[model samples]
Target: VQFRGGTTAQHATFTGAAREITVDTDKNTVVVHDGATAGGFPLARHDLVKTAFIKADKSAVAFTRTGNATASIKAGTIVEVNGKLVQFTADTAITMPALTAGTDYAIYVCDDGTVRADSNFSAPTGYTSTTARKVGGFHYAPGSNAAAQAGGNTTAQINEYSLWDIKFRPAALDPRGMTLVAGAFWADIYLLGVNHLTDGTSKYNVTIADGSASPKKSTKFGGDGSAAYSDGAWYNFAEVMTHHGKRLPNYNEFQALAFGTTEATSSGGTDVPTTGVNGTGATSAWNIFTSKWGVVQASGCLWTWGNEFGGVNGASEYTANTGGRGSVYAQPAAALFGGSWFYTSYSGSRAAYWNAGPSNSSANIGARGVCDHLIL
Candidate 1:
């Protein structure tokens, strides 16, 4: 239950009248209303529960549930877990760790609102699943017609890099006669797309910096209309785009290169659901973009969130009807609250797993999980 200073719960507070009795286990987070509760009360969601999780391993995220508890965690009519607020009218299961895979760790959820050493057992790997996106369908295509989609508005900013990935065995060097060596299982892949918001300008002032302490690097692409998206600028996907060796040392281009594809192709006026947009026939690419800050795996394992590719056009329209918006775009594919990024991984060609931070715990961005201790 010891937080290493600055743990989010340590810095927040709840507001309500003293007439209303409440409980917050993890510091002043968890709260309960023993007194009659009414409208106009000044308490936010995090104020109703009092609980904190104690992990045998500092890195493990624990899943939580509430049991009937008359007083202690097990005493009151099971209210909340680790202070997680429930918003739906019906009961819902809160699967968390928010991410994980290895088979190690046990944790305890403690709620001071009542005396429950722990009401839930942090289960092991069996409570997980996996799903995959197609090799294509990784980016957000915004237009309506099958031909080309409205990606982003002229004013919106698209992320600078698009990642392409596939897993497969290395084929022997292909000769002119070499057959199309294409199978995700044969190669580990990663691709990058240009982060260009569609303003009147059709080109990106491209730059690639060395991911280093100083970040010394260069730019690419050139002038005279020749450096524009309309002019069909060339990218470096053809060069050293393998492993950590890929780089455009010169830093002189203004166009984008499609990495990881069997070949480079223009998205310009091209219909989405392109082979790269989704698998051969899938029409939606919800997996690529998510609200979770990063991609989530089927098992609910956490992963890293990459550079933002803001402002997708048709994503919302496409997101609304799929399996009742059960797609990745409808919600966060996965997310974490606090931690430094280690590395990001891709499943299929679309985003799949995002393993970042020191452990499964990623620092909550801007406002997410800010009130984990709030009561609903």
Candidate 2:
């Protein structure tokens, strides 16, 4: 006969797997389950046995760089899942046995006892469509002639670029007034806002534009407010950024806007240019809202446009002080005031982007060459 304990509020009396643990007040307990945490399950010895098993149906791991134990298998660790030994390919991605397509997994990345960096691996999608043509490394870093011609044949010399600055972040203006430039590299741009260094916590927002004829834009706000992040969280690769942008002179680098100042100050800039007018103004507004690209289809025919306010011109120093490039000379609407060298290369059918900015020696997220396998 099973006897129910009278009133053990925060304690438990068990028989089967719960016998090893003692009951306690101020602590919750579950019988069928060992304890509140997966760590509650005690290990008898330091044996290298399979801790858990994941099947294909259980593969819904989020791709991240922090401590994700289940998703992280060291270069030489043995794990059994779905009747197979865990193995990874030379491409830096591993195939989990327990995770199959369309399946779900309840994985735990516990670090309380063993300092294992937890991670997740998605089930095989048969083939991971190449994202190599997605983004380009900033061109200005290792190049001297970044402003050259674009066209056929000479496609193997250039790289991609973006032009970002702290003034474009939310703390610089109104966080809600952020928008994307006309022709960004891929389909979007990312605006990362960092706060506090010792804590390594911040926010990230991406500006995506529909590539249709009437391209509209939207921003995906993340970071602390992100569904995945929280305050005071420790991340191995989190840093407070000063400011940077795409190297190219196009909208590919124009992701989201920061809106206001980090200290709630106003957008700083004076003597604004008359170049970028979005038609919603009565003048006196900063004309640095346009985006430009140097299409290299003509070998050396660099073209730029979109509310340009500054660039190699003695007339429009107005944009030089406040916004990035303030107001540069774009083609069509604004004329090229000077000649710059640029390079290009063919990436399958698509082309990589590089703007007219300087090089940056900052660390990009994730393990090197990891992007070659999955969507990053």
Q: TM-score, each model?
A: 0.16, 0.20
lDDT of 1 by residue, 8-73 (tens): 342234333545434444343334333344321223555434332222222211122232111111
Against the true structure, whose TM-score is highest? 2
TM-score quality measure for candidate 2: 0.20
lDDT of 2 by residue, 193-269 (tens): 22212111111121111111111111122334222222211011111121111121222222111111011111122
Candidate 2: regions farther than 4 A off: 1-6, 10-93, 96-214, 217-376
Segments of candidate 1 deviating more than 4 angstroms: 1-228, 231-376
Q: The CA-based lDDT of model 2 is what?
A: 0.20
Every model's Cα RMSD, please? 24.1, 19.3
